[PDB]
């Protein structure tokens, strides 16, 4: 399977079985940044779910536990001292996913405790009638990269616990974010700052977590408006965050944005599966599938002799390189 070759290659190149972390790059000098490591954790979980190679599956399943243990060995179990609410929420979401796959109670405790800290203490209605602050150290801006991943984490917690509190939280966060952090037509704004107001800079990862939270709200509530919201955001992405040949942008040099295609592809796959299951937006579904297959082909054609694909699809770094592996594990 294409997703097999890609994930095995990625592990061969970047996985450090000693530290139980990914290397940040092929110089193997530094391990990956904390939040990105949650995104590679999710990549291992997607490859686990995608593969039908029984041997590779059982190995990726041990690696789910290892990625957690390697990060907890370095940083500890309690991430609530991290000043970036997004750092905390990426790991809360990953932990919720690890609970769904493994049923290990440690992952539910990590997901729930870290989600509850952020939502309970960092949701605010004094500025802009709602939304979660970017930081817990300073309160100046409310950002797409915390609010939509928080809605996603709440949806996973809802699916796990069936505690309606988490569906209420997902709904409250998503509705606020669609109002204050999008143009209402599927373009997701980076953030809203107290002084300057909205910053209407769109990126792959914020498109992605808005699409994912919208699809998850559709799945939890059956309300087709949420699927309309996801489709609008996928249409924005495919017509704007692409080059003139329709290949998804390379978002360097910012290190956080370089691998954002990973988070976008993961969430576009959720949308593709939901359209395929529901028969919603059939015209768009056919166009969307053609455009995704084109992007995946383009990434595949960009692999080196070790079957690694740098993020510039049209020294290798694990975040930039992850996007092709995620694309083949949809
Ligand atoms: C939370 C956590 O993962 C931190 O480790 C990480 O440093 C934070 C980075 O987030 C900030 C930067 C993100 C990228 O910003 C750049 O691109 C934006 C979109 O084009 C521009 O608006 C911005 O000026 C800059 O060029 C940004 O997406 C995020 O909202 C933060 O501002 C992380 O949040």
CSV table of C-alpha atoms and ligand atoms in Angstrom, one decimal:
chain,number,residue,atom,x,y,z
A,1,UNK,CA,0.0,0.0,0.0
A,2,UNK,CA,1.2,3.5,-0.9
A,3,UNK,CA,0.5,4.7,2.7
A,4,UNK,CA,2.6,1.8,4.0
A,5,UNK,CA,5.8,2.6,1.9
A,6,UNK,CA,5.4,6.3,3.0
A,7,UNK,CA,4.9,5.7,6.8
A,8,UNK,CA,7.7,3.0,7.0
A,9,UNK,CA,10.1,5.4,5.1
A,10,UNK,CA,9.2,8.3,7.4
A,11,UNK,CA,9.8,6.1,10.5
A,12,UNK,CA,13.2,4.8,9.0
A,13,UNK,CA,14.3,8.4,8.3
A,14,UNK,CA,13.0,10.3,11.4
A,15,UNK,CA,11.9,7.9,14.2
A,16,UNK,CA,14.3,7.8,17.2
A,17,UNK,CA,13.5,4.5,19.0
A,18,UNK,CA,15.8,5.5,21.9
A,19,UNK,CA,14.1,8.9,22.8
A,20,UNK,CA,10.7,7.6,21.4
A,21,UNK,CA,10.4,10.9,19.5
A,22,UNK,CA,10.7,12.0,15.8
A,23,UNK,CA,13.9,13.8,14.8
A,24,UNK,CA,13.2,17.4,13.6
A,25,UNK,CA,15.2,16.8,10.5
A,26,UNK,CA,17.6,14.4,8.7
A,27,UNK,CA,20.7,15.9,10.6
A,28,UNK,CA,19.2,14.1,13.7
A,29,UNK,CA,20.5,16.9,16.0
A,30,UNK,CA,17.2,18.0,17.7
A,31,UNK,CA,13.9,16.1,18.3
A,32,UNK,CA,10.6,17.6,16.9
A,33,UNK,CA,8.9,20.5,18.6
A,34,UNK,CA,6.2,19.6,21.2
A,35,UNK,CA,3.0,20.6,19.2
A,36,UNK,CA,4.3,19.1,15.9
A,37,UNK,CA,5.1,15.8,17.7
A,38,UNK,CA,1.3,15.7,18.6
A,39,UNK,CA,0.6,16.1,14.8
A,40,UNK,CA,3.1,13.2,14.0
A,41,UNK,CA,1.4,11.2,16.8
A,42,UNK,CA,-1.9,11.6,14.9
A,43,UNK,CA,-0.1,10.7,11.6
A,44,UNK,CA,1.0,7.3,13.2
A,45,UNK,CA,-2.7,6.8,14.4
A,46,UNK,CA,-4.0,7.6,10.8
A,47,UNK,CA,-1.4,5.1,9.3
A,48,UNK,CA,-2.6,2.6,11.9
A,49,UNK,CA,-6.2,3.1,10.8
A,50,UNK,CA,-5.4,3.1,7.0
A,51,UNK,CA,-3.0,0.1,6.6
A,52,UNK,CA,-4.2,-3.5,6.0
A,53,UNK,CA,-0.6,-4.8,6.4
A,54,UNK,CA,-1.2,-6.7,9.7
A,55,UNK,CA,2.6,-6.6,10.7
A,56,UNK,CA,3.0,-2.8,10.0
A,57,UNK,CA,-0.4,-2.3,11.9
A,58,UNK,CA,0.7,-4.0,15.2
A,59,UNK,CA,4.0,-2.0,15.0
A,60,UNK,CA,2.3,1.3,14.4
A,61,UNK,CA,0.0,0.4,17.3
A,62,UNK,CA,3.0,0.0,19.8
A,63,UNK,CA,4.3,3.3,18.3
A,64,UNK,CA,1.1,5.1,19.4
A,65,UNK,CA,2.1,4.4,23.1
A,66,UNK,CA,5.8,5.1,22.4
A,67,UNK,CA,5.1,8.7,21.0
A,68,UNK,CA,3.2,9.5,24.3
A,69,UNK,CA,5.8,7.9,26.5
A,70,UNK,CA,8.8,9.7,24.8
A,71,UNK,CA,7.1,13.1,25.2
A,72,UNK,CA,6.0,12.5,28.8
A,73,UNK,CA,9.6,11.3,29.6
A,74,UNK,CA,11.0,14.7,28.4
A,75,UNK,CA,8.1,17.1,29.4
A,76,UNK,CA,6.1,15.3,32.1
A,77,UNK,CA,2.3,14.4,32.1
A,78,UNK,CA,1.1,18.0,33.1
A,79,UNK,CA,1.3,20.4,30.1
A,80,UNK,CA,-0.8,23.2,31.8
A,81,UNK,CA,2.4,25.3,32.5
A,82,UNK,CA,2.9,25.7,28.7
A,83,UNK,CA,1.8,29.3,28.0
A,84,UNK,CA,0.4,28.4,24.5
A,85,UNK,CA,-3.2,27.1,24.8
A,86,UNK,CA,-2.7,25.6,21.3
A,87,UNK,CA,0.3,23.5,22.6
A,88,UNK,CA,-1.9,22.1,25.3
A,89,UNK,CA,-4.9,21.5,22.9
A,90,UNK,CA,-3.0,19.7,20.2
A,91,UNK,CA,-1.9,17.1,22.8
A,92,UNK,CA,-5.4,17.0,24.4
A,93,UNK,CA,-6.8,16.2,20.9
A,94,UNK,CA,-4.1,13.6,20.2
A,95,UNK,CA,-4.7,12.0,23.6
A,96,UNK,CA,-8.5,11.8,22.9
A,97,UNK,CA,-7.7,9.9,19.6
A,98,UNK,CA,-5.2,7.6,21.4
A,99,UNK,CA,-8.0,6.7,23.9
A,100,UNK,CA,-10.4,5.9,21.0
A,101,UNK,CA,-7.8,3.5,19.4
A,102,UNK,CA,-6.2,1.9,22.6
A,103,UNK,CA,-8.9,2.3,25.3
A,104,UNK,CA,-6.0,3.1,27.8
A,105,UNK,CA,-7.6,5.2,30.6
A,106,UNK,CA,-4.3,7.4,30.9
A,107,UNK,CA,-5.2,8.9,27.4
A,108,UNK,CA,-8.8,9.9,28.4
A,109,UNK,CA,-7.4,11.4,31.7
A,110,UNK,CA,-4.8,13.4,29.6
A,111,UNK,CA,-7.3,14.5,27.0
A,112,UNK,CA,-10.1,15.5,29.5
A,113,UNK,CA,-7.8,17.2,32.1
A,114,UNK,CA,-5.9,19.3,29.4
A,115,UNK,CA,-9.1,20.2,27.5
A,116,UNK,CA,-10.9,21.2,30.7
A,117,UNK,CA,-8.0,23.4,31.8
A,118,UNK,CA,-8.1,25.3,28.5
A,119,UNK,CA,-11.9,25.5,28.0
A,120,UNK,CA,-12.8,26.2,31.7
A,121,UNK,CA,-10.0,28.9,32.3
A,122,UNK,CA,-9.3,30.3,28.8
A,123,UNK,CA,-12.8,30.6,27.2
A,124,UNK,CA,-13.7,34.3,27.7
A,125,UNK,CA,-16.8,36.3,26.9
A,126,UNK,CA,-15.4,39.8,28.0
A,127,UNK,CA,-13.6,40.2,24.6
A,128,UNK,CA,-15.6,39.6,21.3
A,129,UNK,CA,-18.5,37.7,23.1
A,130,UNK,CA,-16.6,34.4,23.3
A,131,UNK,CA,-13.6,32.4,22.2
A,132,UNK,CA,-10.5,30.9,23.7
A,133,UNK,CA,-7.4,33.0,24.3
A,134,UNK,CA,-4.2,32.1,22.4
A,135,UNK,CA,-2.0,32.2,25.5
A,136,UNK,CA,-2.7,31.6,29.2
A,137,UNK,CA,0.2,33.9,30.1
A,138,UNK,CA,-1.2,37.1,28.3
A,139,UNK,CA,-4.7,37.7,27.0
A,140,UNK,CA,-4.4,39.8,23.8
A,141,UNK,CA,-5.6,37.6,20.9
A,142,UNK,CA,-8.0,34.7,20.1
A,143,UNK,CA,-6.7,32.4,17.4
A,144,UNK,CA,-8.1,29.9,14.9
A,145,UNK,CA,-5.2,27.5,15.8
A,146,UNK,CA,-6.6,27.2,19.4
A,147,UNK,CA,-10.3,27.6,18.8
A,148,UNK,CA,-11.0,25.1,16.0
A,149,UNK,CA,-8.7,22.4,17.4
A,150,UNK,CA,-10.5,22.9,20.8
A,151,UNK,CA,-13.9,22.3,19.0
A,152,UNK,CA,-12.3,19.1,17.5
A,153,UNK,CA,-11.0,17.9,20.9
A,154,UNK,CA,-14.4,18.6,22.5
A,155,UNK,CA,-16.0,16.5,19.7
A,156,UNK,CA,-13.7,13.5,20.3
A,157,UNK,CA,-14.4,13.9,24.1
A,158,UNK,CA,-18.1,13.9,23.3
A,159,UNK,CA,-17.8,10.7,21.1
A,160,UNK,CA,-15.8,9.0,23.9
A,161,UNK,CA,-17.9,10.1,27.0
A,162,UNK,CA,-21.3,11.0,25.5
A,163,UNK,CA,-21.2,13.8,28.0
A,164,UNK,CA,-23.3,16.5,26.4
A,165,UNK,CA,-21.1,19.2,28.1
A,166,UNK,CA,-18.4,18.5,25.4
A,167,UNK,CA,-21.0,18.8,22.5
A,168,UNK,CA,-22.2,22.1,24.1
A,169,UNK,CA,-18.5,23.2,24.2
A,170,UNK,CA,-17.8,22.1,20.6
A,171,UNK,CA,-20.9,24.0,19.4
A,172,UNK,CA,-20.3,27.2,21.4
A,173,UNK,CA,-16.6,27.4,20.2
A,174,UNK,CA,-17.4,26.6,16.6
A,175,UNK,CA,-20.3,29.0,16.3
A,176,UNK,CA,-18.2,31.8,17.9
A,177,UNK,CA,-15.3,31.0,15.6
A,178,UNK,CA,-17.4,30.9,12.4
A,179,UNK,CA,-18.8,34.3,13.4
A,180,UNK,CA,-15.6,36.1,14.6
A,181,UNK,CA,-12.8,34.1,12.8
A,182,UNK,CA,-14.2,33.6,9.3
A,183,UNK,CA,-15.7,35.7,6.5
A,184,UNK,CA,-18.9,33.5,6.8
A,185,UNK,CA,-18.0,32.1,3.3
A,186,UNK,CA,-15.3,29.6,4.3
A,187,UNK,CA,-12.2,31.8,4.6
A,188,UNK,CA,-10.8,31.2,8.1
A,189,UNK,CA,-9.0,34.2,9.7
A,190,UNK,CA,-5.8,33.6,11.6
A,191,UNK,CA,-6.9,35.5,14.8
A,192,UNK,CA,-8.7,38.4,16.3
A,193,UNK,CA,-6.6,40.8,18.4
A,194,UNK,CA,-7.9,43.3,21.1
A,195,UNK,CA,-6.3,46.4,19.5
A,196,UNK,CA,-6.1,45.6,15.8
A,197,UNK,CA,-9.2,43.3,15.4
A,198,UNK,CA,-9.4,40.5,12.9
A,199,UNK,CA,-6.3,39.3,10.9
A,200,UNK,CA,-7.7,37.8,7.7
A,201,UNK,CA,-4.7,35.7,6.8
A,202,UNK,CA,-5.7,32.2,5.8
A,203,UNK,CA,-3.5,29.1,6.0
A,204,UNK,CA,-3.8,25.3,5.4
A,205,UNK,CA,-3.9,24.3,9.1
A,206,UNK,CA,-6.7,26.7,10.1
A,207,UNK,CA,-8.7,25.8,7.0
A,208,UNK,CA,-8.1,22.1,8.1
A,209,UNK,CA,-9.2,22.3,11.7
A,210,UNK,CA,-12.3,24.5,10.8
A,211,UNK,CA,-13.2,21.8,8.2
A,212,UNK,CA,-12.6,19.0,10.7
A,213,UNK,CA,-14.7,20.6,13.5
A,214,UNK,CA,-17.5,21.4,11.0
A,215,UNK,CA,-17.6,17.7,9.8
A,216,UNK,CA,-17.5,16.5,13.4
A,217,UNK,CA,-20.4,18.8,14.3
A,218,UNK,CA,-22.3,17.5,11.3
A,219,UNK,CA,-21.6,13.9,12.6
A,220,UNK,CA,-22.6,14.7,16.2
A,221,UNK,CA,-25.8,16.7,15.4
A,222,UNK,CA,-26.9,15.6,11.9
A,223,UNK,CA,-27.3,19.4,11.0
A,224,UNK,CA,-26.4,19.8,7.3
A,225,UNK,CA,-25.5,23.5,7.9
A,226,UNK,CA,-22.2,22.2,9.4
A,227,UNK,CA,-21.4,20.2,6.3
A,228,UNK,CA,-22.2,23.3,4.2
A,229,UNK,CA,-19.7,25.2,6.4
A,230,UNK,CA,-17.0,22.5,5.7
A,231,UNK,CA,-17.7,22.4,2.0
A,232,UNK,CA,-17.4,26.3,1.8
A,233,UNK,CA,-14.1,26.1,3.6
A,234,UNK,CA,-12.8,23.2,1.3
A,235,UNK,CA,-13.8,25.3,-1.8
A,236,UNK,CA,-12.0,28.4,-0.4
A,237,UNK,CA,-8.8,26.2,0.2
A,238,UNK,CA,-8.8,24.5,-3.3
A,239,UNK,CA,-9.3,27.8,-5.2
A,240,UNK,CA,-7.1,30.1,-3.1
A,241,UNK,CA,-4.3,28.2,-1.1
A,242,UNK,CA,-2.9,26.5,-4.3
A,243,UNK,CA,-0.5,27.4,-7.1
A,244,UNK,CA,-1.8,28.1,-10.6
A,245,UNK,CA,-1.7,24.4,-11.5
A,246,UNK,CA,-4.0,23.6,-8.4
A,247,UNK,CA,-1.2,22.1,-6.2
A,248,UNK,CA,-1.5,23.0,-2.5
A,249,UNK,CA,0.8,25.9,-1.5
A,250,UNK,CA,4.2,25.4,0.2
A,251,UNK,CA,3.8,27.7,3.2
A,252,UNK,CA,7.5,28.2,4.3
A,253,UNK,CA,9.5,29.7,5.6
A,254,UNK,CA,7.6,29.9,8.9
A,255,UNK,CA,8.4,26.5,10.6
A,256,UNK,CA,4.9,26.1,12.1
A,257,UNK,CA,3.2,26.6,8.7
A,258,UNK,CA,5.7,24.5,6.6
A,259,UNK,CA,4.0,21.2,7.4
A,260,UNK,CA,0.4,22.6,7.7
A,261,UNK,CA,-0.6,20.5,4.7
A,262,UNK,CA,-0.4,17.5,7.1
A,263,UNK,CA,-3.3,18.9,9.2
A,264,UNK,CA,-5.2,20.1,6.1
A,265,UNK,CA,-5.0,16.6,4.4
A,266,UNK,CA,-6.0,14.8,7.6
A,267,UNK,CA,-9.2,17.0,7.8
A,268,UNK,CA,-10.0,17.0,4.0
A,269,UNK,CA,-10.0,13.2,4.2
A,270,UNK,CA,-12.8,13.4,6.9
A,271,UNK,CA,-14.8,15.6,4.5
A,272,UNK,CA,-14.1,13.3,1.6
A,273,UNK,CA,-15.3,10.2,3.6
A,274,UNK,CA,-18.5,12.1,4.9
A,275,UNK,CA,-19.5,13.3,1.3
A,276,UNK,CA,-18.9,9.7,0.0
A,277,UNK,CA,-21.1,8.2,2.8
A,278,UNK,CA,-24.0,10.9,2.7
A,279,UNK,CA,-24.2,11.8,-1.0
A,280,UNK,CA,-24.1,15.5,0.1
A,281,UNK,CA,-22.8,18.0,-2.6
A,282,UNK,CA,-22.2,15.4,-5.4
A,283,UNK,CA,-20.9,17.9,-8.0
A,284,UNK,CA,-18.4,19.3,-5.5
A,285,UNK,CA,-17.5,15.7,-4.3
A,286,UNK,CA,-16.5,14.7,-7.8
A,287,UNK,CA,-14.3,17.9,-8.3
A,288,UNK,CA,-12.9,17.6,-4.8
A,289,UNK,CA,-11.9,13.9,-5.3
A,290,UNK,CA,-10.2,14.8,-8.7
A,291,UNK,CA,-8.3,17.7,-7.0
A,292,UNK,CA,-7.2,15.5,-4.0
A,293,UNK,CA,-6.0,12.7,-6.3
A,294,UNK,CA,-4.0,15.2,-8.4
A,295,UNK,CA,-2.4,16.6,-5.1
A,296,UNK,CA,-1.6,13.1,-3.9
A,297,UNK,CA,-0.1,12.1,-7.2
A,298,UNK,CA,2.0,15.3,-7.3
A,299,UNK,CA,3.3,14.5,-3.8
A,300,UNK,CA,4.1,10.9,-4.7
A,301,UNK,CA,6.0,12.1,-7.9
A,302,UNK,CA,8.1,14.3,-5.5
A,303,UNK,CA,9.6,11.4,-3.4
A,304,UNK,CA,13.4,10.9,-3.2
A,305,UNK,CA,15.3,7.6,-3.3
A,306,UNK,CA,14.4,7.0,0.4
A,307,UNK,CA,10.6,7.6,-0.4
A,308,UNK,CA,10.6,10.9,1.6
A,309,UNK,CA,8.7,13.8,0.1
A,310,UNK,CA,9.7,17.4,1.0
A,311,UNK,CA,6.8,19.9,1.6
A,312,UNK,CA,7.5,21.7,-1.8
A,313,UNK,CA,5.3,19.3,-3.8
A,314,UNK,CA,5.4,21.4,-7.0
A,315,UNK,CA,18.4,18.1,4.7
A,316,UNK,CA,14.8,16.9,5.0
A,317,UNK,CA,12.5,18.1,7.9
A,318,UNK,CA,10.0,15.7,9.5
A,319,UNK,CA,7.1,18.4,9.6
A,320,UNK,CA,7.5,19.5,5.9
A,321,UNK,CA,7.8,15.8,4.9
A,322,UNK,CA,4.8,14.5,7.0
A,323,UNK,CA,2.2,16.1,4.6
A,324,UNK,CA,2.8,13.4,1.8
A,325,UNK,CA,2.6,10.5,4.4
A,326,UNK,CA,-0.7,11.9,5.7
A,327,UNK,CA,-2.0,12.3,2.1
A,328,UNK,CA,-1.4,8.6,1.5
A,329,UNK,CA,-3.0,7.6,4.9
A,330,UNK,CA,-6.4,9.2,4.2
B,1,LIG,C1,1.0,27.6,19.3
B,1,LIG,C2,2.2,26.7,19.5
B,1,LIG,O1,2.2,25.7,18.6
B,1,LIG,C3,3.5,27.5,19.5
B,1,LIG,O2,4.6,26.6,19.7
B,1,LIG,C4,3.6,28.2,18.2
B,1,LIG,O3,4.8,29.0,18.3
B,1,LIG,C5,2.5,29.2,17.9
B,1,LIG,C6,2.7,29.9,16.5
B,1,LIG,O4,1.5,30.6,16.2
B,1,LIG,C7,1.6,31.9,15.8
B,1,LIG,C8,2.2,32.0,14.4
B,1,LIG,C9,1.3,31.3,13.4
B,1,LIG,C10,1.9,31.6,12.0
B,1,LIG,O5,2.0,33.0,11.8
B,1,LIG,C11,2.4,33.6,10.7
B,1,LIG,O6,1.5,33.3,9.6
B,1,LIG,C12,0.2,34.0,9.9
B,1,LIG,C13,-0.7,33.5,8.8
B,1,LIG,O7,-0.3,33.9,7.5
B,1,LIG,C14,0.4,35.5,9.9
B,1,LIG,O8,-0.9,36.0,10.2
B,1,LIG,C15,1.4,35.8,11.0
B,1,LIG,O9,1.7,37.2,11.1
B,1,LIG,C16,2.7,35.1,10.7
B,1,LIG,O10,3.3,35.5,9.4
B,1,LIG,C17,-0.2,31.8,13.5
B,1,LIG,O11,-0.9,31.0,12.5
B,1,LIG,C18,-0.7,31.7,14.9
B,1,LIG,O12,-2.1,32.1,14.9
B,1,LIG,C19,0.1,32.5,15.8
B,1,LIG,O13,0.1,33.9,15.5
B,1,LIG,C20,1.2,28.4,18.0
B,1,LIG,O14,0.0,29.3,17.9
